[PDB]
Design a protein around this ligand. Structure first.
Ligand SMILES: C[C@H]1CCCC(=O)CCC/C=C/c2cc(O)cc(O)c2C(=O)O1
Ligand SMILES: C[C@H]1CCCC(=O)CCC/C=C/c2cc(O)cc(O)c2C(=O)O1
Lengths: 263, 263
């Protein structure tokens, strides 16, 4: 029993969102591809443990594509956080345990830094601080090329190609269109704006993760930052999409981690 | 010119060792396989930069096989350090910049902890603190099976299969015999004895590394420990054998790092 619906916020974004369960709030912010169907399985699992779980397609992406161009251009964690806060307000969510990978992780940190009152606890996964070589010129090519290149890269970082493929043609068709939009608005601006400064990290509890199979160099700096700052740091099975590759393990982490901070 | 030969120390180890160059000492400790031909290329490079480089096959391994059984059983970093110290004494090496991967890294740390007076600076790479699942039962199967599995594992962790293969038939034939001996004496005892406590890490300069391409989880703890302790930590290209996969880059690292500490 999950709500699937739409809401147009004051910033003009026509959001597609989902919600399941009752209890303390948990918010699942997608990665840069902004496709919330990736959370379908773990959403129910988390919800079944006594939480109200909310997810949504990101601005300009997938079902939330009816949004103003600025909401998906020159993107930063802080920009996204603003939009999300507006969304939470309309959804009547006061405080939540928040998860997010990549740009979603950047968003989580922005939320913890600038909107601590709304965050129980934050769960960032693979915060981009330095892009790998595959993305260096992605914004410079045409859409068709972007979709071809990015569909491959994503599959390669999937952590489980079988599960990835298993998302289905509808999802993959949505992703096809998301790729160029993500490329033009995310990779150049997300990393330099990473909210990983000292003052961004200590207002609320944070449990940070990197993929177990992810090549060490990719998110190496996340590890060092966390360790030096005294922030809980660890790994999760898979790579960049633990929610897709390892839904069960992912759900257990969210539940167990969020549960620690409940009163 | 490169010198190659044997020396029998007072602990009964008939060591196979090589040296090249003149200047401050650099010691290259092998990984668990104990095969020093792996350093051949970088050794020349390092030596050409004004250092006297020394390397050797490890006790019981390859050409250093004529050694007491005790020297290749229940191995720990401290145990290896003792043997190395005896060797350095015989070779009249008073102080050196020391490199080591895996069990070699454990040895480096042991040297930094217990024999700081002989270490100018330590360069540990991928210190085992927790074995991956592939090693869980390695000590329990037939020698042929060990050799087969470890040959595969090693190639998989090589960071460059072509360069790995290109070590040559002589080297691989030696490795084949080393695998079972390594299995019985190293993986069970090396990790628990890792000299990674606070008390082991501050006596002499340390520059710690992990492979860029190595799956994050494998040596994740190395990074956290180093960061927590205020020790220089970074990556090197490749995986578990940077000296084989990326000899130029490896040589550069050793030279630059060691040069920081000369006076
Ligand atoms: C698209 C997704 C998987 C895309 C597959 C892929 O190329 C993974 C590279 C790891 C970096 C991702 C990333 C980098 C940025 O600068 C900005 C981002 O929004 C992302 C990001 O969202 O990762
Ligand atoms: C044999 C070498 C290349 C062996 C290739 C391999 O399986 C790499 C797994 C990473 C672990 C290495 C390791 C673990 C130990 O407990 C003791 C060790 O001596 C090693 C070690 O020396 O790694």
């Amino acid at each position: 029993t999950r709500t699937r619906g739409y809401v147009t916020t004051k910033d003009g974004i026509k959001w597609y969102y989902e919600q399941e369960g009752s209890g303390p709030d948990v918010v699942l912010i997608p990665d840069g591809l902004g496709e919330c169907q990736m959370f379908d399985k773990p959403m129910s699992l988390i919800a079944s443990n006594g939480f109200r779980v909310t997810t949504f397609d990101m601005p300009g992406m997938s079902r939330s594509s009816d949004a103003p161009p600025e909401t998906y251009q020159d993107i930063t964690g802080r920009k996204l956080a603003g939009y999300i806060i507006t969304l939470l307000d309309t959804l009547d969510i006061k405080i939540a345990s928040v998860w997010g990978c990549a740009s979603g992780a950047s968003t989580v940190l922005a939320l913890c830094s600038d909107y601590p009152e709304r965050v129980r606890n934050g769960m960032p996964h693979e915060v981009p601080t330095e892009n790998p070589d595959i993305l260096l010129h992605i914004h410079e090519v045409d859409p068709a090329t972007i979709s071809q290149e990015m569909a491959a890269n994503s599959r390669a970082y999937s952590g489980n190609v079988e599960a990835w493929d298993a998302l289905g043609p509808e999802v993959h068709a949505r992703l096809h269109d998301n790729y160029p939009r993500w490329a033009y608005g995310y990779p150049r601006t997300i990393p330099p704006s990473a909210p990983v400064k000292t003052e961004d990290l200590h207002k609320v509890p944070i449990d940070w993760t990197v993929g177990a199979s992810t090549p060490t160099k990719l998110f190496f700096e996340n590890i060092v930052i966390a360790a030096r700052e005294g922030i809980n740091i660890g790994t999760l099975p898979g790579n960049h999409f633990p929610y897709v590759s390892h839904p069960e393990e992912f759900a257990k982490y969210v539940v167990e981690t969020s549960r620690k901070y409940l009163k």
